[PDB]
Design a protein around this ligand. Structure first.
Ligand SMILES: Nc1ncnc2c1ncn2[C@@H]1O[C@H](COP(=O)(O)OP(=O)(O)OP(=O)(O)O)[C@@H](O)[C@H]1O
Ligand SMILES: [Ca+2]
Ligand SMILES: [Ca+2]
Ligand SMILES: [Mg+2]
Ligand SMILES: [Mg+2]
Length: 352
């Protein structure tokens, strides 16, 4: 049915007699969980020869699926990826079709071209070693890191960001912050409350980063991390996963990228592995970013704490879905799911 639909759209844009056939390459992750990103193969005839194209569909989840997010705007993700392609040389996939109604499949989706390359893995976290990124030479890992920071810098350098990306919206942080509170509330409905998150929201309110929030907002990638970039030869070839795209202070993206790797360092520590301590260090990342944009970054501390709430929110949703599908037993304290609770307790104990 996803394939039938793409086959149909294919029939409308290719020569008559193309007779396209679409099948699914990959509709689940490596743990057999159904995926929002679906890799498709399209085969057709042209001038008596076979053409074969891979296509990637991003589909909006149904309620029955236990969605991470309270709402979905794939149309926004579509337009941002398209605009990023038009206005920068940040590598992104070419977008092909958006169906915004949900009348065709049941739910909205968009279609992208396939980009070949490798991604530093989430399963197992790349900090666990035994993958192409963890096993590369220091120098090559650092070359990847700096290219990824450079892609970020380039996205943050797009002029008149709030004009160009206005469909995305006090300030942009205030608004982003109320969205995060909505997401938490959404997650509560599925797993129960976290006294830690609640105290953290009070903390974030009462220690607002005024200067950062009063500067000019930039386009924020969102889930800005190496696991959302396809790479060929340690250089980015597609920036993926724009579902948390927003307008906001540039610190959010930079903090997220650093913190993300911290979460995986922590996971590696708990599997008693050494991980990758020289990758994505705050000092290295700040220096590169600052060298490239000539822009001084605010203290990231508040934005680490904030990324920690957002990560906790993902874990609460991961948790709801795992218990819904019987795959794990409800933990009795939801905070047991937060690998990084320790990290956050220590950040909250700091004074900046
Ligand atoms: N345009 C594309 N071309 C080739 N492969 C892609 C493309 N988009 C996604 N993929 C494959 O699917 C994986 C998932 O992509 P993405 O991270 O955008 O999906 P997801 O559903 O949001 O996120 P997660 O991996 O966080 O669940 C990517 O690592 C990549 O292997
Ligand atoms: Ca371009
Ligand atoms: Ca203290
Ligand atoms: Mg992803
Ligand atoms: Mg995602």
């Amino acid at each position: 049915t996803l394939p039938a639909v793409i086959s149909r759209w294919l029939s409308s844009v290719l020569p008559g007699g193309a007779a396209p056939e679409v099948t699914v390459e990959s509709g689940v992750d490596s743990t057999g969980m159904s995926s929002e990103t679906i890799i498709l193969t399209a085969r057709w005839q042209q001038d008596g020869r076979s053409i074969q194209q891979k296509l990637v569909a991003r589909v909006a989840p149904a309620a029955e699926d236990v969605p991470v997010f309270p709402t979905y705007r794939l149309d926004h993700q579509f337009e941002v990826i398209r605009l990023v392609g038009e206005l920068t040389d940040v590598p992104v996939p070419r977008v092909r079709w958006i169906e915004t109604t949900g009348d065709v499949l049941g739910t909205p989706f968009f279609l992208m071209d396939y980009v070949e390359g490798v991604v530093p893995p989430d399963v197992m976290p790349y900090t666990f070693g035994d993958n192409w990124f963890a096993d590369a030479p220091a120098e090559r890992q650092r070359q990847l890191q700096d290219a990824t920071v450079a892609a970020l810098a380039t996205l943050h350098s797009i002029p008149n960001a709030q004009n160009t990306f206005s469909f995305l919206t006090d300030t942009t942080l205030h608004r982003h912050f109320n969205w995060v509170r909505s997401w938490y509330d959404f997650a509560v409905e599925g797993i129960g409350r976290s006294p830690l998150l609640e105290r953290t929201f009070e903390w974030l309110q009462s220690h607002w980063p005024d200067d950062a929030a009063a500067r000019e907002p930039v386009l924020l990638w969102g889930d800005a991390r190496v696991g959302n970039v396809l790479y060929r030869d340690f250089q980015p070839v597609a920036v993926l996963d724009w579902e948390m795209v927003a307008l906001g202070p540039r610190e959010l993206d930079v903090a997220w990228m650093i913190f993300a790797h911290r979460v995986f360092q922590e996971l590696a520590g708990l599997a008693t592995l050494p991980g990758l301590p020289e990758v994505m260090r705050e000092d290295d990342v700040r220096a590169t970013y600052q060298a490239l944009t000539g822009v001084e970054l605010g203290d990231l501390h508040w934005f680490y704490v904030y990324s920690g709430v957002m990560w906790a929110c993902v874990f609460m949703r991961t948790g709801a879905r795992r218990v819904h599908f019987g795959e794990i037993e409800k933990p009795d304290d939801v905070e047991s799911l937060f690998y990084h609770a320790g990290l956050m307790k220590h950040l909250l104990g700091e004074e900046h």
